Write a protein that holds these residues in place. Structure first.
Motif, PDB file in Angstrom:
ATOM      1  N   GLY A  28       0.803  -1.209   0.000  1.00  0.00           N
ATOM      2  CA  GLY A  28       0.000   0.000   0.000  1.00  0.00           C
ATOM      3  C   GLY A  28       0.837   1.261   0.000  1.00  0.00           C
ATOM      4  N   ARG A  29       2.074   1.099  -0.419  1.00  0.00           N
ATOM      5  CA  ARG A  29       2.976   2.205  -0.561  1.00  0.00           C
ATOM      6  C   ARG A  29       4.191   1.669  -1.296  1.00  0.00           C
ATOM      7  NH1 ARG A  29       4.841   3.825   5.275  1.00  0.00           N
ATOM      8  NH2 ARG A  29       6.705   4.499   4.092  1.00  0.00           N
ATOM      9  N   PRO A  30       5.122   2.551  -1.677  1.00  0.00           N
ATOM     10  CA  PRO A  30       6.273   1.917  -2.338  1.00  0.00           C
ATOM     11  C   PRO A  30       7.103   1.178  -1.294  1.00  0.00           C
ATOM     12  CG  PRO A  30       6.482   4.320  -2.336  1.00  0.00           C
ATOM     13  CD  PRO A  30       5.239   4.016  -1.573  1.00  0.00           C
ATOM     14  N   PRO A  31       7.497  -0.081  -1.583  1.00  0.00           N
ATOM     15  CA  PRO A  31       8.076  -0.997  -0.579  1.00  0.00           C
ATOM     16  C   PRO A  31       9.192  -0.300   0.179  1.00  0.00           C
ATOM     17  CG  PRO A  31       7.838  -2.096  -2.704  1.00  0.00           C
ATOM     18  CD  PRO A  31       7.542  -0.650  -2.942  1.00  0.00           C
ATOM     19  N   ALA A  32       9.290  -0.529   1.486  1.00  0.00           N
ATOM     20  CA  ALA A  32      10.235   0.219   2.303  1.00  0.00           C
ATOM     21  C   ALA A  32      10.964  -0.645   3.322  1.00  0.00           C
ATOM     22  CB  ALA A  32       9.529   1.348   3.002  1.00  0.00           C
ATOM     23  N   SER A  33      12.090  -0.139   3.817  1.00  0.00           N
ATOM     24  CA  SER A  33      12.790  -0.715   4.962  1.00  0.00           C
ATOM     25  C   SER A  33      12.011  -0.358   6.239  1.00  0.00           C
ATOM     26  CB  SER A  33      14.176  -0.106   5.028  1.00  0.00           C
ATOM     27  OG  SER A  33      14.058   1.229   5.460  1.00  0.00           O
ATOM     28  N   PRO A  34      12.395  -0.911   7.410  1.00  0.00           N
ATOM     29  CA  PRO A  34      11.638  -0.570   8.621  1.00  0.00           C
ATOM     30  C   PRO A  34      11.781   0.886   8.961  1.00  0.00           C
ATOM     31  CG  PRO A  34      12.999  -2.473   9.015  1.00  0.00           C
ATOM     32  CD  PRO A  34      13.379  -1.978   7.666  1.00  0.00           C
ATOM     33  N   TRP A  35      12.811   1.514   8.434  1.00  0.00           N
ATOM     34  CA  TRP A  35      13.139   2.854   8.857  1.00  0.00           C
ATOM     35  C   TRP A  35      12.625   3.861   7.849  1.00  0.00           C
ATOM     36  CZ3 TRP A  35      16.862  -0.982   8.013  1.00  0.00           C
ATOM     37  CH2 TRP A  35      17.182  -1.737   9.144  1.00  0.00           C
ATOM     38  N   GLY A  36      11.737   3.402   6.965  1.00  0.00           N
ATOM     39  CA  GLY A  36      11.063   4.286   6.029  1.00  0.00           C
ATOM     40  C   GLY A  36      11.647   4.521   4.635  1.00  0.00           C
ATOM     41  N   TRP A  37      12.905   4.145   4.389  1.00  0.00           N
ATOM     42  CA  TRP A  37      13.470   4.366   3.056  1.00  0.00           C
ATOM     43  C   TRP A  37      13.054   3.298   2.042  1.00  0.00           C
ATOM     44  CZ3 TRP A  37      16.684   0.264   2.418  1.00  0.00           C
ATOM     45  CH2 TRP A  37      17.388  -0.212   3.508  1.00  0.00           C
ATOM     46  N   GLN A  38      12.879   3.685   0.779  1.00  0.00           N
ATOM     47  CA  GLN A  38      12.373   2.756  -0.228  1.00  0.00           C
ATOM     48  C   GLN A  38      13.452   1.760  -0.596  1.00  0.00           C
ATOM     49  OE1 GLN A  38      10.381   4.729  -3.488  1.00  0.00           O
ATOM     50  NE2 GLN A  38       9.281   6.137  -2.124  1.00  0.00           N
ATOM     51  N   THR A  39      13.062   0.514  -0.851  1.00  0.00           N
ATOM     52  CA  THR A  39      14.028  -0.581  -0.953  1.00  0.00           C
ATOM     53  C   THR A  39      14.074  -1.250  -2.326  1.00  0.00           C
ATOM     54  OG1 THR A  39      14.700  -2.718  -0.099  1.00  0.00           O
ATOM     55  CG2 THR A  39      12.364  -2.240  -0.200  1.00  0.00           C
ATOM     56  N   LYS A  40      13.308  -0.705  -3.262  1.00  0.00           N
ATOM     57  CA  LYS A  40      13.414  -1.124  -4.643  1.00  0.00           C
ATOM     58  C   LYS A  40      13.815   0.112  -5.451  1.00  0.00           C
ATOM     59  CE  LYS A  40      11.802  -5.427  -4.132  1.00  0.00           C
ATOM     60  NZ  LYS A  40      10.581  -5.943  -3.478  1.00  0.00           N
ATOM     61  N   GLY A  41      15.108   0.211  -5.746  1.00  0.00           N
ATOM     62  CA  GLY A  41      15.601   1.203  -6.675  1.00  0.00           C
ATOM     63  C   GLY A  41      16.388   2.399  -6.158  1.00  0.00           C
ATOM     64  N   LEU A  42      16.046   2.877  -4.961  1.00  0.00           N
ATOM     65  CA  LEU A  42      16.653   4.069  -4.376  1.00  0.00           C
ATOM     66  C   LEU A  42      18.159   3.951  -4.257  1.00  0.00           C
ATOM     67  CD1 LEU A  42      15.847   5.973  -1.086  1.00  0.00           C
ATOM     68  CD2 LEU A  42      16.580   6.730  -3.403  1.00  0.00           C
ATOM     69  N   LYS A  43      18.873   4.671  -5.114  1.00  0.00           N
ATOM     70  CA  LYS A  43      20.320   4.648  -5.057  1.00  0.00           C
ATOM     71  C   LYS A  43      20.734   5.345  -3.784  1.00  0.00           C
ATOM     72  CE  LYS A  43      21.711   4.170  -9.910  1.00  0.00           C
ATOM     73  NZ  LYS A  43      21.619   4.854 -11.229  1.00  0.00           N
ATOM     74  N   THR A  44      21.839   4.878  -3.226  1.00  0.00           N
ATOM     75  CA  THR A  44      22.160   5.170  -1.843  1.00  0.00           C
ATOM     76  C   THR A  44      23.625   5.599  -1.623  1.00  0.00           C
ATOM     77  OG1 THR A  44      21.018   4.393   0.167  1.00  0.00           O
ATOM     78  CG2 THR A  44      22.953   3.268  -0.488  1.00  0.00           C
ATOM     79  N   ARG A  45      24.508   5.260  -2.572  1.00  0.00           N
ATOM     80  CA  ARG A  45      25.855   5.842  -2.628  1.00  0.00           C
ATOM     81  C   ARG A  45      25.743   7.358  -2.673  1.00  0.00           C
ATOM     82  NH1 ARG A  45      30.998   7.180  -5.693  1.00  0.00           N
ATOM     83  NH2 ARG A  45      31.964   5.426  -4.544  1.00  0.00           N
ATOM     84  N   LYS A  46      26.477   8.043  -1.805  1.00  0.00           N
ATOM     85  CA  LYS A  46      26.382   9.490  -1.785  1.00  0.00           C
ATOM     86  C   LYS A  46      26.995  10.050  -3.060  1.00  0.00           C
ATOM     87  CE  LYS A  46      29.234  12.485  -0.249  1.00  0.00           C
ATOM     88  NZ  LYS A  46      28.012  12.981  -0.975  1.00  0.00           N
ATOM     89  N   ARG A  47      26.421  11.123  -3.584  1.00  0.00           N
ATOM     90  CA  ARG A  47      26.844  11.636  -4.884  1.00  0.00           C
ATOM     91  C   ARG A  47      28.250  12.250  -4.877  1.00  0.00           C
ATOM     92  NH1 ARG A  47      21.628  15.396  -6.059  1.00  0.00           N
ATOM     93  NH2 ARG A  47      22.470  15.541  -8.191  1.00  0.00           N
ATOM     94  N   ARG A  48      28.509  13.130  -3.917  1.00  0.00           N
ATOM     95  CA  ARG A  48      29.722  13.936  -3.925  1.00  0.00           C
ATOM     96  C   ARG A  48      30.964  13.249  -3.354  1.00  0.00           C
ATOM     97  NH1 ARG A  48      29.484  17.393  -0.450  1.00  0.00           N
ATOM     98  NH2 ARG A  48      27.661  16.474   0.616  1.00  0.00           N
ATOM     99  N   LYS A  49      30.997  11.924  -3.380  1.00  0.00           N
ATOM    100  CA  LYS A  49      32.140  11.189  -2.846  1.00  0.00           C
ATOM    101  C   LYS A  49      33.370  11.512  -3.674  1.00  0.00           C
ATOM    102  CE  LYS A  49      32.382   6.833  -0.407  1.00  0.00           C
ATOM    103  NZ  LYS A  49      33.072   5.531  -0.600  1.00  0.00           N
TER     104      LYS A  49
END
Ligand SMILES: [Mg+2]
Ligand SMILES: [Mg+2]
Ligand SMILES: [Mg+2]
Ligand SMILES: [Mg+2]
Ligand SMILES: [Mg+2]
Ligand SMILES: [Mg+2]
Ligand SMILES: [Mg+2]
Ligand SMILES: [Mg+2]
Ligand SMILES: [Mg+2]
Ligand SMILES: [Mg+2]
Ligand SMILES: [Mg+2]
Ligand SMILES: [Mg+2]
Ligand SMILES: [Mg+2]
Ligand SMILES: [Mg+2]
Ligand SMILES: [Mg+2]
Ligand SMILES: [Mg+2]
Ligand SMILES: [Mg+2]
Ligand SMILES: [Mg+2]
Ligand SMILES: [Mg+2]
Ligand SMILES: [Mg+2]
Ligand SMILES: [Mg+2]
Ligand SMILES: [Mg+2]
Ligand SMILES: [Mg+2]
Ligand SMILES: [Mg+2]
Ligand SMILES: [Mg+2]
Ligand SMILES: [Mg+2]
Ligand SMILES: [Mg+2]
Ligand SMILES: [Mg+2]
Ligand SMILES: [Mg+2]
Ligand SMILES: [Mg+2]
Ligand SMILES: [Mg+2]
Ligand SMILES: [Mg+2]
Ligand SMILES: [Mg+2]
Ligand SMILES: [Mg+2]
Ligand SMILES: [Mg+2]
Ligand SMILES: [Mg+2]
Ligand SMILES: [Mg+2]
Ligand SMILES: [Mg+2]
Ligand SMILES: [Mg+2]
Ligand SMILES: [Mg+2]
Ligand SMILES: [Mg+2]
Ligand SMILES: [Mg+2]
Ligand SMILES: [Mg+2]
Ligand SMILES: [Mg+2]
Ligand SMILES: [Mg+2]
Ligand SMILES: [Mg+2]
Ligand SMILES: [Mg+2]
Ligand SMILES: [Mg+2]
Ligand SMILES: [Mg+2]
Ligand SMILES: [Mg+2]
Ligand SMILES: [Mg+2]
Ligand SMILES: [Mg+2]
Ligand SMILES: [Mg+2]
Ligand SMILES: [Mg+2]
Ligand SMILES: [Mg+2]
Ligand SMILES: [Mg+2]
Ligand SMILES: [Mg+2]
Ligand SMILES: [Mg+2]
Ligand SMILES: [Mg+2]
Ligand SMILES: [Mg+2]
Ligand SMILES: [Mg+2]
Ligand SMILES: [Mg+2]
Ligand SMILES: [Mg+2]
Ligand SMILES: [Mg+2]
Ligand SMILES: [Mg+2]
Ligand SMILES: [Mg+2]
Ligand SMILES: [Mg+2]
Ligand SMILES: [Mg+2]
Ligand SMILES: [Mg+2]
Ligand SMILES: [Mg+2]
Ligand SMILES: [Mg+2]
Ligand SMILES: [Mg+2]
Ligand SMILES: [Mg+2]
Ligand SMILES: [Mg+2]
Ligand SMILES: [Mg+2]
Ligand SMILES: [Mg+2]
Ligand SMILES: [Mg+2]
Ligand SMILES: [Mg+2]
Ligand SMILES: [Mg+2]
Ligand SMILES: [Mg+2]
Ligand SMILES: [Mg+2]
Ligand SMILES: [Mg+2]
Ligand SMILES: [Mg+2]
Ligand SMILES: [Mg+2]
Ligand SMILES: [Mg+2]
Ligand SMILES: [Mg+2]
Ligand SMILES: [Mg+2]
Ligand SMILES: [Mg+2]
Ligand SMILES: [Mg+2]
Ligand SMILES: [Mg+2]
Ligand SMILES: [Mg+2]
Ligand SMILES: [Mg+2]
Ligand SMILES: [Mg+2]
Ligand SMILES: [Mg+2]
Ligand SMILES: [Mg+2]
Ligand SMILES: [Mg+2]
Ligand SMILES: [Mg+2]
Ligand SMILES: [Mg+2]
Ligand SMILES: [Mg+2]
Ligand SMILES: [Mg+2]
Ligand SMILES: [Mg+2]
Ligand SMILES: [Mg+2]
Ligand SMILES: [Mg+2]
Ligand SMILES: [Mg+2]
Ligand SMILES: [Mg+2]
Ligand SMILES: [Mg+2]
Ligand SMILES: [Mg+2]
Ligand SMILES: [Mg+2]
Ligand SMILES: [Mg+2]
Ligand SMILES: [Mg+2]
Ligand SMILES: [Mg+2]
Ligand SMILES: [Mg+2]
Ligand SMILES: [Mg+2]
Ligand SMILES: [Mg+2]
Ligand SMILES: [Mg+2]
Ligand SMILES: [Mg+2]
Ligand SMILES: [Mg+2]
Ligand SMILES: [Mg+2]
Ligand SMILES: [Mg+2]
Ligand SMILES: [Mg+2]
Ligand SMILES: [Mg+2]
Ligand SMILES: [Mg+2]
Ligand SMILES: [Mg+2]
Ligand SMILES: [Mg+2]
Ligand SMILES: [Mg+2]
Ligand SMILES: [Mg+2]
Ligand SMILES: [Mg+2]
Ligand SMILES: [Mg+2]
Ligand SMILES: [Mg+2]
Ligand SMILES: [Mg+2]
Ligand SMILES: [Mg+2]
Ligand SMILES: [Mg+2]
Ligand SMILES: [Mg+2]
Ligand SMILES: [Mg+2]
Ligand SMILES: [Mg+2]
Ligand SMILES: [Mg+2]
Ligand SMILES: [Mg+2]
Ligand SMILES: [Mg+2]
Ligand SMILES: [Mg+2]
Lengths: 272, 49
Positions: free
Chosen positions: A242-263
């Motif tokens: 009933g929402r876009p699938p998420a981790s327990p802590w609220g972040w989306q878990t199908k697709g959301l890139k997570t490596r920080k950009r400015r590394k």
RNA sequence: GUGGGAGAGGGUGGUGGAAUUCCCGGAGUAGCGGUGAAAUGCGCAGAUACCGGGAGGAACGCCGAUGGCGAAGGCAGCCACCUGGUCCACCCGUGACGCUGAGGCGCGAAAGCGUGGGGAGCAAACCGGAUUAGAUACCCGGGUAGUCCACGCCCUAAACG
RNA sequence: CCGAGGGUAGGGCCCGUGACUGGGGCGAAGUCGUAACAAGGUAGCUGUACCGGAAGGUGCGGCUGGA
RNA sequence: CGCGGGGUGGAGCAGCCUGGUAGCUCGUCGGGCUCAUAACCCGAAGGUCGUCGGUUCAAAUCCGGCCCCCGCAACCA
RNA sequence: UGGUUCGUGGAGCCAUGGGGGAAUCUGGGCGGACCACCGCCUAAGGCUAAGUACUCCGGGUGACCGAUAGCGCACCAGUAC
RNA sequence: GAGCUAGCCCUGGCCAGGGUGAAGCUGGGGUGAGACCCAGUGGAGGCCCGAACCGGUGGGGGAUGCAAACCCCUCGGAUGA
RNA sequence: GAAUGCCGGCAUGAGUAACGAUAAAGAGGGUGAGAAUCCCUCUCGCCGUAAGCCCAAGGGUUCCUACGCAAUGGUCGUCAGCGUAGGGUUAGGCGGGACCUAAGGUGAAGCCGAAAGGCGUAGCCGAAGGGCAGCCGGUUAAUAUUCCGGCCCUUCCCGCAGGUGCGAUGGGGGGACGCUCUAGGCUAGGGGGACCGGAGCCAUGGACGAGCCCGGCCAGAAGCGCAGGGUGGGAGGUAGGCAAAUCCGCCUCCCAACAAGCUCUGCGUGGUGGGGAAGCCCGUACGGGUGACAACCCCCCGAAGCCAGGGAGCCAAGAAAAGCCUCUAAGCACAACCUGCGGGAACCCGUACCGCAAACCGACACAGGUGGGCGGGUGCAAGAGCACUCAGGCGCGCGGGAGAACCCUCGCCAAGGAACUCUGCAAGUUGGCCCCGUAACUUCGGGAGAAGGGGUGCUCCCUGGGGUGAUGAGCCCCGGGGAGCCGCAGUGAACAGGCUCUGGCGACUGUUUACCAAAAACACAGCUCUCUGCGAACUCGUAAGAGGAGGUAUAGGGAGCGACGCUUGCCCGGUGCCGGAAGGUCAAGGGGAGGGGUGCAAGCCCCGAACCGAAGCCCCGGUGAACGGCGGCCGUAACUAUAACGGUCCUAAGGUAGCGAAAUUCCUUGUCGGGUAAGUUCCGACCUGCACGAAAAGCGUAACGACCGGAGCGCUGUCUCGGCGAGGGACCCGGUGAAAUUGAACUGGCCGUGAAGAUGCGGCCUACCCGUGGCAGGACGAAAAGACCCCGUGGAGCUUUACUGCAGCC
RNA sequence: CGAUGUCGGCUCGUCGCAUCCUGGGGCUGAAGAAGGUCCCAAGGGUUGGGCUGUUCGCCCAUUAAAGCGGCACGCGAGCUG
């Protein structure tokens, strides 16, 4: 090869065990060089911070050699190949003419009695370690350092490798196990060959217990929970999310890139 | 059944002892309160040697 | 047996160039693809055409033949290794040791199946654009298995002279 | 003791019958389309594979029973 | 019982909310191509807009009452 | 951003975390944005009694209680429990 | 407040007695070599029956109880998560 | 005078319920003011893998003795765990500390944080883990591995005596390790003996007998002996073990290949020390004397214990530090250390008693809970099982009667066998072992204890193997064949499956609502998507930091599905995520066109348009094992019927396979078929699917289930339809003696009336006063300020494209 | 609403009569037998099974008959759940 069983019990009909024929008559390890007390504990100072860890066999840490540049030029005889509870790979016990005994992570094709050595010198042979530079373009390699003099960090998992692709001034381009394209500094050591125990992926745990033996506690679905516990908790008899699938802590878990950009690492990477 | 009181001299001492209370501000205030109150016993009496 | 000869016969490892596609750098515009004709599609967010570099997979142009080899299926760049069948000469050896062959056993194009790779091109399915009375087809633009490798199954054929 | 046979229990083969169902066959002039036979208007057939109201189409390889 | 959507040529649909014109495909009918039919081509016909009532200068169109049609609802006890 | 009556208001003064960043008497702050005038003070160093607060403690008094009151306790009570 | 309860870490302890008979090894057979097939040995397993121990299935009793979760019969697991 | 008000006191129920396990009592004699209840004796019963015995935790005077009975004891009480007093706990060797390290804690260095404080490599603290030297008897009323007796040890210190380069918190070695299965020899423990020792005993028909009954050991230094564990010895070279090294490690040659040799344990033996039954006599609450100069021997079973770092196999690969060996450095070698023998020195704390329980945790002398060690004998296939019983400990701290209802627990039944009921719920049948013999299906393991059968005791004869013994007797385990005996019945008692057929769901073993739900729910292997290049992603924390992980794409985080088989179709229009150096918009800032306020001005001070300006949004694509979605209306076939075919409107696309009246079907007991005498359930079909459908997976599936449905067999008190018996209550007597409730009470029926359901008001009817056992119709009976419902601009938990903030990321 | 336990079943019943049976009777388009219909009458009687939680109903096999309704949809300080 993989050991297989007959179905004399349920869960024995799928279960499957590694072949240990490369484990030379040396099952219990080596004091002196290793082991250390290994400190089991599923969590930080206080609280659990990685779920579902615990139980499972007691272990001894084998303190392996991840920087081979100490014994530049000094060769060693491969004395044995033994089981290492704390990694997927197997480990080589080697005897340096120096007298000193180290463990190297054991590459595919390594035979006991073999000669092995590390340095700019170093015949390009399975087992040998070289700075990435002097290694021929296109050869497959492992236990590669990321930055020089910082220790082997790439390709140590069973049956993994990286391949040298080309060079670029001070950097040689690598193709990592993931398939990424990386600029890794020329001066980084890496040892030729693939990791071996490549049938590791073919093993079928076979039952719940086996999971526990390896200290993997039961992982429970967000769907199984309640709204207090998880975004997926509730409602009535089953529910599709009933929402876009998420981790327990609220972040989306199908697709959301997570490596920080400015590394700052970015300008050294060329792939997925 | 098993009830909630499972006496242990070491536990009672490590848990509610004078030295435990003394260790933190939370506990030090407990001694202060009990003193001002006029409590005959600041901490529980754990026995034996 | 001695002595030779031809061959894409089979297995493993290695390697070479042409070509497609994608990536980057250059240079350069207003169109390119495609058809019976068009359209979908791609392109001013810089395409097509051309130049330079890089990566990757698959297949081997000319030689090439109406040719050669294999028991059939099948087998085609080059190199080395391992190996099978086969023909000529010399008439030296054994000396009837022969032929066929129910069953058995082994091999067996493609498609397909399992496990893990690999995936440039093509391409069932599928999605569009045309054609048609209607098209689940023939044509065009896309595109997933698969096609490729390893091991394991499958035993089919206009397996045809 | 054995023993015709009776009883009990579990099987094997065979025949009859069964709502409904699968395909087959035959049935002078019903519906739909055009697959094949002439290059049958996409050469055909084929083993296999997927797809499609239907014949069938397509992919892969093969065949001359076609140029 | 309640709620809200719909009855337009033979069929299926536009046309209403901003009143004045009823249009599209198919079908049907006349002709042509064909030996003939379909396909295709050229012309034509066809609608009390569910009924009752009026609001207006004027109602398929706006407002009421009924009539079939369709979908939803009817929970806590 | 806080302080002040001041809640962004015409929002000064006082304090500041961030950025810029002087001058030494013809130097600087202030008198409610700002500017002129006329005035008041002299920042970025410190100390300073007394008058003011309190009542564990002693003392005095009560149109205060008198053992279900008055302190939880008049009594070995922050006790027994 | 984790002396109940929940998880994890460190360190010790417990599981009577029975069944079933995997791989493996040995011999035999088979083949060009194999696979494979026989025995015999062997003693695997979130394997089986069942005490301890850990549970809490169904029924009855208990209901100011023996008990603020008990009792009796019956039942699940019992080398494992 | 009312607040279900607060505190205190006393009533009511009431001489009522109960007196805390149905393991059980009787008598005789004592003592006493007073005995069912205390002491003693005889008889009876109960536990005996405990209800016996020893430790640990906890408890803290409960232990022993004298004296007591007001209270405490569910009654009594002369008794006590109670009251008064007095005694009682002895260690170099047992345990803990002047030893060690684990998790963890603390923490100089260091890092961090408004303060409080948080991390923290070294060190220190931290124990049932490591290390470490005492065994058997005897004594007290109460302590003893503590005192005493015998035998045996450990440390220091100081001596002499003899050896050697001695020598660190440092180098190295060792300590040092998993699970399952196990070999050889041992001890513990036990059974047997015609052998030895012993008070005694012939009973009631017989027996003076290899008769009965009782007992035939324990510790033990050196030295042996049997088991068994540990380990190779030299010589070079050396760059490693963070200085050094003769040590260790590595390379190279010789000698052993063996436990040969050294050691080190265990066990037998051992100088010697101690123990020593029945019965009988005694006076103790209890123990003593004699039995006795007791004897103290032989066989047999035999561990889970010892040899112990034994062996074999396996994967999940199984602490640390010190003690101890060694090597050397500083230093010192008149030191020192090692060995032998002497003398001296050897502290602190615990010790009583309870300890599966009346002394611990449950307010109680509470049918509950509580870790470890021992736990004998016979019989039963085995065993810690079960029935009886040693030792030892109890009869459960109210009794006596009676023999109703009724309850609990139990036993049995004519005839029928599920007719009972929501349901065979309950109860029954079945039951151990050996042997025959076993189906569909199946993942080839299973299904299987399938199902269904037979056997089972005692006696005598013949007979096969082992084990211990010499190759033998015996002793002890497993076997085979043949005759016969008895009863209703031979696992004669106790422990010990009822079975099948067929659906649903879940694969399976697991897990869960401590205290009403054990399931079809959670988990599970496995499958897919997704993030993550390592100072990883993610998580906790303001930070430092830690987890991840001392891991590195075959790895780690998140999501969902949930073995396995066959499979998972179409829609990217909206939402999400992903990809887009164009464009549009976009805040601070940059910028100043231009204007404003003041000044005589220089100036000082405000606003301010172009234009440059990020992410984000818009825009351009992609993405469904991402959020999700997967149509309507008319017509048509040469019987009707139906509709392969067609027309038309809309969509992002219009539900494929496979299922289907289902855990989904409203109308519904749909419609046929099957089971039945009869079937709203069940099973097979059909398909008109209100309202299945493909990873909130689709349809299957052998096996598994204290899950859920249907059926049959067997068997029954579930029922027709009850009856009888047993025991614990109930009832009566003596003893102790509650409770919720209670406006007060002198508290009848009917028909009416009344706030609409009257003992209390009206009329009539009935009815002498008061109890005891019973049944529950009523007092709108008790119990809880209704849980549902509504109300209150009451409260919390949860959600989201509600509002507004915040962390977090950009 | 500072509590009137709520369906069905079981057990125990009792009452009404607008009677299902039996007793009495009129009319019948009642020959007789058996019916129909109405009047009087409640004294007694009013079965056992299949399915369903069911009430009811549909069946099975009977019967003289397989009656209807009230009693807080009678009855949970009586049971069931
Ligand atoms: Mg170590
Ligand atoms: Mg933390
Ligand atoms: Mg902490
Ligand atoms: Mg899960
Ligand atoms: Mg839940
Ligand atoms: Mg949430
Ligand atoms: Mg739902
Ligand atoms: Mg949800
Ligand atoms: Mg370019
Ligand atoms: Mg050759
Ligand atoms: Mg010849
Ligand atoms: Mg032949
Ligand atoms: Mg083939
Ligand atoms: Mg192929
Ligand atoms: Mg396929
Ligand atoms: Mg394949
Ligand atoms: Mg293409
Ligand atoms: Mg194409
Ligand atoms: Mg056409
Ligand atoms: Mg048949
Ligand atoms: Mg048929
Ligand atoms: Mg036709
Ligand atoms: Mg044709
Ligand atoms: Mg054709
Ligand atoms: Mg074909
Ligand atoms: Mg096609
Ligand atoms: Mg016409
Ligand atoms: Mg303010
Ligand atoms: Mg200022
Ligand atoms: Mg100022
Ligand atoms: Mg001023
Ligand atoms: Mg002013
Ligand atoms: Mg001051
Ligand atoms: Mg007072
Ligand atoms: Mg007074
Ligand atoms: Mg007071
Ligand atoms: Mg075998
Ligand atoms: Mg076993
Ligand atoms: Mg098991
Ligand atoms: Mg069991
Ligand atoms: Mg339960
Ligand atoms: Mg009043
Ligand atoms: Mg009172
Ligand atoms: Mg009474
Ligand atoms: Mg009574
Ligand atoms: Mg009584
Ligand atoms: Mg006392
Ligand atoms: Mg006395
Ligand atoms: Mg008393
Ligand atoms: Mg006493
Ligand atoms: Mg006393
Ligand atoms: Mg001291
Ligand atoms: Mg210490
Ligand atoms: Mg530590
Ligand atoms: Mg700290
Ligand atoms: Mg220490
Ligand atoms: Mg210790
Ligand atoms: Mg000791
Ligand atoms: Mg004692
Ligand atoms: Mg040392
Ligand atoms: Mg050491
Ligand atoms: Mg006699
Ligand atoms: Mg001895
Ligand atoms: Mg050195
Ligand atoms: Mg004696
Ligand atoms: Mg061993
Ligand atoms: Mg230390
Ligand atoms: Mg030395
Ligand atoms: Mg003692
Ligand atoms: Mg003692
Ligand atoms: Mg015990
Ligand atoms: Mg008692
Ligand atoms: Mg008591
Ligand atoms: Mg007790
Ligand atoms: Mg216990
Ligand atoms: Mg025993
Ligand atoms: Mg026995
Ligand atoms: Mg037995
Ligand atoms: Mg027993
Ligand atoms: Mg009693
Ligand atoms: Mg009977
Ligand atoms: Mg009978
Ligand atoms: Mg019967
Ligand atoms: Mg019945
Ligand atoms: Mg009935
Ligand atoms: Mg049933
Ligand atoms: Mg039952
Ligand atoms: Mg079943
Ligand atoms: Mg079943
Ligand atoms: Mg399950
Ligand atoms: Mg539980
Ligand atoms: Mg519960
Ligand atoms: Mg269960
Ligand atoms: Mg799966
Ligand atoms: Mg870290
Ligand atoms: Mg780590
Ligand atoms: Mg992953
Ligand atoms: Mg799920
Ligand atoms: Mg699930
Ligand atoms: Mg799908
Ligand atoms: Mg979409
Ligand atoms: Mg899109
Ligand atoms: Mg989208
Ligand atoms: Mg975006
Ligand atoms: Mg932007
Ligand atoms: Mg249906
Ligand atoms: Mg449905
Ligand atoms: Mg029927
Ligand atoms: Mg039927
Ligand atoms: Mg579903
Ligand atoms: Mg789905
Ligand atoms: Mg499922
Ligand atoms: Mg289970
Ligand atoms: Mg039945
Ligand atoms: Mg009965
Ligand atoms: Mg009785
Ligand atoms: Mg009495
Ligand atoms: Mg009266
Ligand atoms: Mg009345
Ligand atoms: Mg009156
Ligand atoms: Mg009256
Ligand atoms: Mg009553
Ligand atoms: Mg009663
Ligand atoms: Mg009542
Ligand atoms: Mg009441
Ligand atoms: Mg209320
Ligand atoms: Mg409600
Ligand atoms: Mg409001
Ligand atoms: Mg109410
Ligand atoms: Mg009331
Ligand atoms: Mg009447
Ligand atoms: Mg009549
Ligand atoms: Mg029923
Ligand atoms: Mg009713
Ligand atoms: Mg009645
Ligand atoms: Mg009613
Ligand atoms: Mg009622
Ligand atoms: Mg009642
Ligand atoms: Mg219920």
């Amino acid at each position: 090869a993989v050991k297989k069983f007959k179905p004399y019990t349920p869960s024995r009909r799928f279960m499957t065990v590694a072949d240990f024929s490369e484990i030379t008559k040396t099952e219990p390890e080596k004091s002196l060089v290793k082991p250390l007390k290994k400190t089991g504990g599923r969590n930080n100072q206080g609280r659990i911070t990685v779920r579902f860890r615990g139980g499972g066999h007691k272990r001894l840490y084998r303190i392996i050699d991840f920087k081979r540049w100490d014994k530049v030029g000094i060769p060693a005889k491969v004395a044995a190949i033994e089981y290492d509870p704390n990694r997927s790979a197997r480990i080589a016990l080697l005897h340096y003419v120096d007298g000193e005994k180290r463990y190297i992570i054991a590459p595919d094709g390594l035979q006991v009695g073999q000669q092995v050595v590390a340095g700019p010198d170093a015949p390009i042979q399975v087992g040998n370690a070289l700075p990435l530079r002097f290694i021929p373009v296109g050869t497959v390699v492992h236990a590669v350092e990321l930055e020089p003099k910082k220790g082997a960090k790439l390709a140590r998992a069973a049956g993994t490798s990286a391949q040298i692709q080309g060079r670029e001034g001070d950097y040689v381009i690598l193709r990592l196990p993931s398939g990424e394209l990386r600029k890794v500094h020329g001066e980084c050591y890496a040892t030729v060959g693939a990791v071996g125990n490549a049938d590791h992926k073919n093993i079928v745990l076979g039952k719940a217990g086996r999971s526990r033996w390896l200290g993997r506690r039961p992982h429970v679905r967000g769907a199984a929970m309640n709204p207090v516990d998880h975004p997926h908790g509730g409602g009535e008899g089953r529910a599709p999310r009933g929402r876009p699938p998420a981790s327990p802590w609220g972040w989306q878990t199908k697709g959301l890139k997570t490596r920080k950009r400015r590394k700052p690492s970015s300008r050294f990477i060329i792939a997925r | 059944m098993k009830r909630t009181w499972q006496p242990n001299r070491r536990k009672r001492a490590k848990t509610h002892g004078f030295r435990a209370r003394m260790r933190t501000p939370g506990g030090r205030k407990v001694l202060k309160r009990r003193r001002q109150k006029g409590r005959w016993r600041l901490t529980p009496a754990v026995r034996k040697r």
